[PDB]
Design a protein around this ligand. Structure first.
Ligand SMILES: Cc1ccc(OCCN(C)C)cc1C(=O)N[C@H](C)c1cc(-c2cnn(C)c2)cc(-c2cnn(C(C)C)c2)c1
Ligand SMILES: [Cl-]
Ligand SMILES: [Cl-]
Ligand SMILES: [Cl-]
Ligand SMILES: [Cl-]
Ligand SMILES: [Zn+2]
Ligand SMILES: [Zn+2]
Ligand SMILES: [Zn+2]
Ligand SMILES: [Zn+2]
Ligand SMILES: [Zn+2]
Length: 307
């Protein structure tokens, strides 16, 4: 019998058939199911996931997941019991998810991550991220739910899910410098780094951010524009409104229709033409107009031209 916390460093233990796994190993999981109350069986003699009970397992658990929350393995194994049953079709060369248990926001996020450049700091996230691009995205979706502290069936927001994931990614080299102009106060330059340098809530178009956005001032309206952007991408979010998506001006977008929270997501991507991925469904179009809430753009190093 093998016990592990990372499926890498395995620990071989000797088991019997009298006591259950709970008494011998603590809460133990096979695949995604809970074999805590289940007694050992013949075909079980394989590797089992156990909650860390010593310092060696606690250290290995942090090295793989970068978390010390004792409930993390439980939330992760509970989500995996559903995600392993989902279907992950290949739509337009991308891995999507067939609709199941309100996974519309998870599918839009999964398709978005396969199109932007991202390096995850937790090794467990990075390893499953690679398998997700290759078609095996069950572990990756389950880990996303665990890190975001969300459960299967819960209604998720794509912008909130991306932000949670961005905080577990290497965005240290990302830098955004803004300039807020105000006729009374003057000019103030602010520098953002990391997660805050790649996301903005207000407008959907990256060009309006470069031209200037009407932002309030402490004295009372100013204008904020982008001076310099050094990031592999930018995420522009705005409340759901009708927007015009043109081929070649963006990478991918998030469509939200329906009421607040209990609504549905769809993924729009710009290839040789505009593609609409709704789980397992694909529709193409030369132009698009609909309710868009998130737009992702590509970037490397931008520097403004206004004094
Ligand atoms: C699907 C879903 C799941 C979870 C969730 O959790 C939010 C709670 N969270 C704070 C923890 C939200 C959503 C969700 O509805 N998302 C969508 C994208 C959404 C729709 C609407 C909206 C308004 N009218 N109608 C008919 C729809 C408004 C907005 C909106 C507005 N302003 N903001 C910014 C500033 C925070 C966002 C977001
Ligand atoms: Cl960490
Ligand atoms: Cl992390
Ligand atoms: Cl609202
Ligand atoms: Cl772009
Ligand atoms: Zn970490
Ligand atoms: Zn389910
Ligand atoms: Zn299920
Ligand atoms: Zn002012
Ligand atoms: Zn849905």
């Amino acid at each position: 019998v093998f016990t592990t916390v990372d499926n890498i460093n395995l620990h071989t233990q000797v088991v019997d058939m009298s006591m259950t796994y709970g008494q011998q190993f603590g809460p133990t999981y096979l695949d995604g199911a809970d074999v805590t109350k289940i007694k050992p069986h013949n075909s079980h003699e394989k590797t089992f996931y156990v909650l860390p009970n010593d310092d060696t397992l606690r250290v290995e658990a942090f090295e793989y997941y970068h978390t010390t929350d004792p409930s993390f393995l439980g939330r992760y194994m509970s989500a995996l019991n559903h995600t392993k049953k989902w279907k992950y079709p290949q739509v337009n060369g991308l891995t999507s998810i067939k609709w199941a248990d309100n996974n519309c926001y998870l599918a839009t996020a999964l398709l978005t991550l396969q199109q932007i450049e991202l390096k995850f700091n937790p090794p467990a996230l990075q390893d499953a991220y690679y398998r997700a691009r290759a078609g095996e995205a069950a572990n990756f979706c389950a880990l996303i739910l665990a890190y975001c502290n969300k459960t299967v069936g819960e209604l998720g927001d794509v912008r909130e899910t991306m932000s949670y994931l961005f905080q577990h990614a290497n965005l240290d080299s990302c830098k955004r410098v803004l300039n807020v102009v105000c006729k009374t106060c003057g000019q103030q330059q602010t520098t953002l780094k990391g997660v805050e340098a790649v996301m903005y809530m207000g407008t959907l178009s990256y060009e309006q951010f470069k031209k200037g956005v009407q932002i309030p001032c402490t004295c009372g309206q100013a204008t904020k524009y982008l001076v310099q952007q050094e990031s592999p991408f930018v995420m522009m979010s705005a409340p759901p409104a009708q927007y015009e998506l043109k081929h070649g001006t963006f990478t991918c977008a998030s469509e939200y229709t329906g009421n607040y929270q209990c609504g549905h997501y769809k993924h729009i991507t710009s290839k040789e033409t505009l593609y609409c991925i709704d789980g397992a469904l694909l529709t193409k179009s030369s132009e698009y107009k609909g309710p868009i809430t998130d737009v992702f753009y590509k970037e490397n190093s931008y520097t403004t031209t206004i004094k």
